[PDB]
Amino acid sequence: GSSGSSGDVFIEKQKGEILGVVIVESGWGSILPTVIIANMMHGGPAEKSGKLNIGDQIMSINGTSLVGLPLSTCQSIIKGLKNQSRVKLNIVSGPSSG
């Protein structure tokens, strides 16, 4: 049961619906500037999943590294998960020390 830490995350949602989550540029400066959660929808899949947190970054999406990819792009790869229910994404607590 109780389990969830910087690693392989699984967001269980329903098809047709969005990931109900907003992402933003990982402040060009951190180790791997990909993308981090800027805000969570009040009743979305991500907010309910509880697998991520405001500030955490995504290393990849279902095996699709976002390293280097622009904020606009990374978002597109996340917007195409609406047609799917279950999605796998790698999360990594942003740069806490600093």
From Swiss-Prot:
PDZ domain boundaries: 8-92
Tissue note: Brain and spinal cord. Isoform 2 is expressed in testis and brain, but not detected in lung, liver or spleen.
Domain of life: Eukaryota
Cellular localisation: Cytoplasm; Cytoplasm, Perinuclear region; Nucleus
Coiled-coil features, chain-numbered ranges: none
Domain statement: Composed of an N-terminal domain that binds Munc18-1 and LIN-2/CASK, a middle phosphotyrosine-binding domain (PID/PTB) that mediates binding with the cytoplasmic domain of the amyloid-beta precursor protein, and two C-terminal PDZ domains thought to attach proteins to the plasma membrane. The autoinhibitory helix linker occludes the APP binding site.
Chain's role: Putative function in synaptic vesicle exocytosis by binding to Munc18-1, an essential component of the synaptic vesicle exocytotic machinery. May modulate processing of the amyloid-beta precursor protein (APP) and hence formation of APP-beta. Component of the LIN-10-LIN-2-LIN-7 complex, which associates with the motor protein KIF17 to transport vesicles containing N-methyl-D-aspartate (NMDA) receptor subunit NR2B along microtubules.
Subunit structure: Part of a multimeric complex containing STXBP1 and STX1A. Interacts with STXBP1. Also part of the brain-specific heterotrimeric complex LIN-10/X11-alpha, LIN-2/CASK, and LIN7. Component of the brain-specific heterotrimeric complex (LIN-10-LIN-2-LIN-7 complex) composed of at least APBA1, CASK, and LIN7, which associates with the motor protein KIF17 to transport vesicles along microtubules. Within the complex, interacts (via PDZ domain) with the motor protein KIF17; the interaction is direct and is required for association of KIF17 with the cargo that is to be transported.
The protein's name in its UniProt record: Amyloid-beta A4 precursor protein-binding family A member 1
Species per Swiss-Prot/TrEMBL record: Homo sapiens
Gene name in the database record: APBA1
